[PDB]
Structure 1
Amino acid sequence: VQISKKRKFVADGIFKAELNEFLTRELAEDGYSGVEVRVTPTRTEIIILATRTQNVLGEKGRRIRELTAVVQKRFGFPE
């Protein structure tokens, strides 16, 4: 069995609040603007908005790779 829709819809909120808080605290230097969490049972993608988006990636897609594994091992859902 799963959780009730009342407790489900609020738990989708505390996810995006802690995510946005941690994203502000980490990416407060490269001009972080906001998340957009497109949920899908296959892949719950998280769209980062930024000012200089090429500098967010790191060296050919290196810095955001750390954040992928962070949000993977943090919130319990598998890779």
Structure 2
Amino acid sequence: ALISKKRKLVADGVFYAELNEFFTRELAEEGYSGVEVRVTPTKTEVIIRATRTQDV
């Protein structure tokens, strides 16, 4: 790790953008509505908002 606080918060933002993109390309026919990421101890959590989750 060992990052600047400035660079860290920006870096996380870029991470969201690239992640958000990849889902918007991949999950389109599932009605992907966007995401959110929760950084926790022991895990990174990614929640997929989709109208149709049976295909996801």
Please indicate, yes or no, whether the TM-score normalized by the shorter chain is above 0.5. yes
Report which structure shows greater RCO (CA 8 Å, sep ≥6): 2
Backbone CA RMSD of aligned residues: 1.2
| Unaligned segments of structure 2, at least 5 residues | none
Equivalent residue runs for 1:24-63 within 5 Å: 24-56=24-56
Q: Supply the distance in 1 between the matched residues of 2:14 and 2:34 (Cα, whole angstroms).
A: 15
Q: Which has the higher strand share?
A: 2
The number of residue pairs the alignment matches comes to: 56
| Unaligned segments of structure 1, at least 5 residues | 57-79
Provide TM-score, normalisation by structure 2.
Answer: 0.91
Provide TM-score, normalisation by structure 1.
Answer: 0.66
Which 4+ runs in 1 deviate beyond 3 A?
none
Q: Which has the higher helix share?
A: 1
Give % identity.
80
